[model samples]
Target: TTALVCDNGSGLVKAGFAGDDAPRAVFPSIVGRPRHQDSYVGDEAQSKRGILTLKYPIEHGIITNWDDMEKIWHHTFYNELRVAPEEHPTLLTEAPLNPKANREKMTQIMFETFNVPAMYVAIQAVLSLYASGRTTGIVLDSGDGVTHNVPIYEGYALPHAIMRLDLAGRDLTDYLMKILTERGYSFVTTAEREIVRDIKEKLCYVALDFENEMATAASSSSLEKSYELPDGQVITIGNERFRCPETLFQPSFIGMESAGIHETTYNSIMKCDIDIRKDLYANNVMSGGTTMYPGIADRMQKEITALAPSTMKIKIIAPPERKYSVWIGGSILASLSTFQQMWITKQEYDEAGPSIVH
Candidate 1:
């Protein structure tokens, strides 16, 4: 049987059968409640925006609303992939440092509710490393709700060295909206905010030398570019392009007291044992949506190099398909004949219950 690989995040869910190159269906991780109905999930929920109250089932990579999550999972199985859960084994992704209780709860649902033949839960950071064809390295993943710096050594995650930053892609969009608003471009409406998000993705970039870039941006009109809004107005954007994404390097720019992502990356590696520190510094894999910004690799490597030991070399691998790396990794793993035996079958669940996962 080709197992099912389902990667669920705070902002999106990617689902498909094993051995596939990419997810068959990718949708928003939100549920909408209409005036006189129960709720809607996935694309239906996304379309019901203003009319229906939208709620996220996951936050910061953790499940918050179980009922809504169950709905999203059901939609993924029956509505999206059109697969029979009882016939196929399943592989799901979870965040680093996720509570053991969360794992048990997920196991219960997959076996007891969905009635899957077998199941496995893998860590997001480790799967990201596998996507880059590395079993030992540091994975720096920044998605919509959270950013994580996790160290993996010989296919095992170092729990003590993992670091998480609350700021991520959503925060960058909000910061961009604030800057645009101050520049007389209003993003008060939902549609306007969507435009603002598009502006951030298309225009924002990380500056290698932020201080120097800021100084030159003030005096140079050459750095300015114009975007045609949906209403036909061409608005010129200047420093905001680099300044907004700069929040990742300098969280203080957005009033966050935590250290920058590079700092966290360096700090996470430093927390590891002395013997493995060199290998961790040598292979830094970048994943998730927020890491797609142009020049982020150069900026992150440079910043970490400064804080790292002079003798150590730093490498950040930003793959083209990094946005879906977790799902891709799961696809690669679940399809292997060797992994078929690793899944816990229904018989095992019946005897051990949810503790089987622990």
Candidate 2:
């Protein structure tokens, strides 16, 4: 039987059956907990989102809230998929260098809470590589919450070699919020942040030539576009469009004392074994939500190529594969006949306990 794949991301939860490339149900990875006893998960929270406090069960790629976490999982299995957890195997995409206790608790939850017959947890970076149709490569992931440069050598993720940057999609969206706030616009409620986030996604783009773009942006002929907020006011922004997403390339502009994605890519490459460096650089797999912006792949290729050795070739995996590649990778991995042996059964969890996590 195929596994029930769940790529529990910070921004969105990709949940569905295995064998298929995309998740059957995609929704916000948040639980709405108003000043009431009851809570809502996924789309339910968003549908009747009347002054409810948003609680993200997973934060920065790890599960932190088990109460709502249980609620969300229950919704995923019962409401979303309508499948019997006791009947089939399960596979989850976990974060890089995840804490040991978290894995054990997750194992316990799958067995005790959902009563899954079998389970397996794969690293997000490795699943990302698998999503790109490879087992070994440097996976550069900049999702909604975090960005990581992880080294995968033959399916094994070098936990120590993983380098991360706090700069990512959320940071840019927050920057947009700050930009709007400084211009006399205020976010009275948390839900209003979506307006800024939407503006960022629709209007923002990474510049191929940052210096030239800056020079042109200051002139009268800089490209200007308009987006209507929920309140029906046309927000006009031009330079901020490219300038906001530009934080991915140069976080220092935003006062974040971190190297850009290209620099981190170089540093991450250097941390690898010298012999496989060429192979790692050649198949630089790009996935994650932040990379979905227009001109990101081209700018990444140009900036990283300039910094990297001439012999090392970088190819950005095509979109929308880059967007949902992690879930798709988990799908591909779970469908393989050989991968069946990798799952830990309920019997194993009973006998060996959370040690079965390994």
Candidate 3:
């Protein structure tokens, strides 16, 4: 039987059989329940956005609604993959520094509710590092709900060195909404956020030199780009294009006092032992969908380079599949023959209980 790899994030769910190049089903991690109809998951939920009250099972990279989360898992196995949970070993990815109780609860559900044959839980940051073929590195994964800067030393994540930024793709989209509204575009509906998100992803980009770019954008019309909405309205995006992504490097833009992504990355490496700081700097890997922004890697590398010692080398390894790095890493790990011995089997779970997962 083929093992199943499922990466459930706050924003999206990636699930498919192990050894595949990519997850066969990738959709939003949202559950929408209509007023008079059955609930929907993933793409189906996304399609019925207006008629349903949407709920997020996961928030800030942590699962909060177990019932909704279970619904998502059931849909993943039964509807999306069309497979029996008992027939395949399962590997699920969890956020770094996830609560112990949550892990135990997840394990209990897998064995008790789903009746999975075997299961293994792995940290998202370590898995992202593994996808890049490195056991020791710093992974900066900025997704929809949260951004994590975790340092992994030889496949183990440094709990104390892990840094998290509350701002991510969601924040960026909101900021874009504010900018557009200020520019005389009204976005009063929940569905409008999706349109704003579309504008952010398709038109927004990071500027190499923020000050100069702002000056150029202000001085000339060349920097302005236009996007046509579904309503057949054309909106011109100016300095807002570069300003939105700048929130990652400058949290003050959003009135958040938190450290920027570069600072978080630098501080994480500095918090580690002196011997590994260089290695961490030399292998700063980028993951998550938000990191896919154009010039993100270049800007992060430049900012980190400035913060690091002049003699040390700073490398930002943004893999081609960084958006799916965690899932791809799970896919690679679950497919390996050596990993067979690592899964907590049903027998082991029945004997030692959920504690066996830890």
- Name the candidate that leads on lDDT: 3
Give the residue spans of candidate 3 off by over 4 A.
Answer: 34-37, 49-51
lDDT of 1: 0.90
lDDT of 2: 0.83
Q: Which residue pairs in candidate 2 have backbone atoms (N, alpha carbon, C) closer than 3 angstroms, thus clashing?
A: none
Model 2 misplaced regions, further than 4 Å: 34-37, 46-52, 220-222
TM-score of each: 0.97, 0.94, 0.97
- For model 3, residues 209-294, the per-residue Cα lDDT tens digits are 89999999989999899999989999998899999999999999999999999999999998999999989999999999999888
Q: Kindly list the per-residue Cα lDDT of model 2 for residues 1-358, writing each as its tens digit.
A: 6579988888888889899868998878989887665778877787667767778888788899988888878878888888888887988888887898998888999999899999999888788898877888888888887889888898888776788887777788888888778888885455788888888888899899988888887886557888887888877888888989888888986799899988888788888899878878777888888888888878878887898878766775545777788888888888998988889999988888887787
Which prediction has more favorable lDDT, 1 or 2? 1
lDDT of 2 at 145: 78
Ten-residue segment with the worst summed lDDT in candidate 2? 312-321
lDDT of 1 at 283: 96
Candidate 2 at 171: error in angstroms?
Answer: 1.7
Between prediction 2 and prediction 3, which has the larger lDDT? 3
Q: Assess each prediction's global lDDT (C-alpha) against the native.
A: 0.90, 0.83, 0.92
Would you list the clashing residue pairs of candidate 1?
none
